[PDB]
Amino acid sequence: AWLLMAFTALALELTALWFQHVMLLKPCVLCIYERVALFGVLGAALIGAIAPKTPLRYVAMVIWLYSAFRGVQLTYEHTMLQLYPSPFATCDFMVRFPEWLPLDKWVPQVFVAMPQWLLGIFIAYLIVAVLVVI
Amino acid sequence: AQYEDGKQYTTLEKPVAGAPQVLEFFSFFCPHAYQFEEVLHISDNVKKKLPEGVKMTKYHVNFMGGDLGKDLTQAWAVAMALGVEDKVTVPLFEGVQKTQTIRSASDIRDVFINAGIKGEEYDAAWNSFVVKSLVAQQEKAAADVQLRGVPAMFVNGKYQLNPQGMDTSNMDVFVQQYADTVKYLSEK
Ligand SMILES: COC1=C(OC)C(=O)C(CC=C(C)C)=C(C)C1=O
Numbered sequence: 001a002w003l004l005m006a007f008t009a010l011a012l013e014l015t016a017l018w019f020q021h022v023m024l025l026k027p028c029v030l031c032i033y034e035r036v037a038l039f040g041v042l043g044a045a046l047i048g049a050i051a052p053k054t055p056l057r058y059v060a061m062v063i064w065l066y067s068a069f070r071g072v073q074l075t076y077e078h079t080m081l082q083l084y085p086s087p088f089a090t091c092d093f094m095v096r097f098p099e100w101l102p103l104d105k106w107v108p109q110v111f112v113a114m115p116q117w118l119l120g121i122f123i124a125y126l127i128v129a130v131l132v133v134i
Numbered sequence: 135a136q137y138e139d140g141k142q143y144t145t146l147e148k149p150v151a152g153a154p155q156v157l158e159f160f161s162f163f164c165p166h167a168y169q170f171e172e173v174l175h176i177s178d179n180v181k182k183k184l185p186e187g188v189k190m191t192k193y194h195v196n197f198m199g200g201d202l203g204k205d206l207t208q209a210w211a212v213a214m215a216l217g218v219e220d221k222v223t224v225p226l227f228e229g230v231q232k233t234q235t236i237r238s239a240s241d242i243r244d245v246f247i248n249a250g251i252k253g254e255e256y257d258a259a260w261n262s263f264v265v266k267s268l269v270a271q272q273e274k275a276a277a278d279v280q281l282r283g284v285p286a287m288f289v290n291g292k293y294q295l296n297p298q299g300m301d302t303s304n305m306d307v308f309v310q311q312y313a314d315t316v317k318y319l320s321e322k
């Protein structure tokens with residue numbers, strides 16, 4: 001089951017990290033939110049959970065759970081706010097991240113040199129969390 | 135007592151000595167906050183609860199539009215420098231989306247004149263010592279309490295409320311809740 005997500009992770013890890021390079025940095029924050037979540041959960045899955053294709057097999061559900069939860073809410077949010085400008089909402093950059101956890105943005109993001117579409121992928125991947133369980 | 139830190143005000147890590155009693159960092163363009171001050175006029179609705187007579191302050195931020203951000207900052211500082219902040223505030227605030235003046239200095243200035251103020255004042259303030267001190271004061275003010283780039287009103291040494299901590303079920307009364315936290319921090 002590892003290679004199953006690794007194929008997309010290998011390409012998705014890079015592809016996601018690809019189309020954000022020379023294309024012209026174009027940094028933000030909410031951007032880093034899905035990126036740190038997208039990479040964290042996809043990795044946590046292959047990097048670990050997605051490996052025991054035979055026992056209790058259910059370590060990934062928790063990992064996938066977080067993927068979309070954040071994903072769906074990272075997709076279905078600021079985006080809607082954009083056409084319905086609301087007070088609490090505003091602009092931002094970088095965004096803090098206590099509990100140490102090295103760089104996080106100071107590198108995962110800046111370590112390089114229309115996103116609306118991105119919204120559909122996560123919203124879709126959401127159901128993948130349930131079916132994959134087996 | 136059902137009321138505690140976390141879902142009312144964000145607890146900073148270090149206050150800024152000598153900093154204004156109540157200071158708001160906002161932008162003239164980019165944030166949805168446009169409604170914050172233009173629609174809910176929170177800075178205005180909230181000032182109405184002035185406790186004991188605490189004075190409020192308004193600051194602009196440097197992000198977005200590199201030079202434009204900084205340029206608008208001077209403009210805002212120029213406003214505070216003339217003392218004619220309230221009058222030009224809205225016209226210039228509303229001047230961004232509803233007039234689209236985001237251009238050069240001489241342009242950004244032109245609308246400033248249009249706000250019903252005489253140029254003889256704006257001219258001196260364009261570079262005067264007072265203005266230079268004010269533009270820097272912004273950045274500094276923000277930097278002392280690490281902003282990030284969002285609308286937030288901090289209270290004398292105290293912290294700013296958590297807009298996401300409160301509730302959003304009464305766009306109207308929301309000011310009261312927004313204003314209940316500020317009042318408390320002022321003398322408590
Ligand atoms: C809203 O935040 C994001 C972007 O906006 C600047 C992106 O461009 C990208 C990358 C864009 C492409 C076309 C791969 C991602 C992944 C993202 O989360």
Ligand SMILES: [Zn+2]
Pocket residue numbers: 172173
């Ligand atoms: Zn109105």
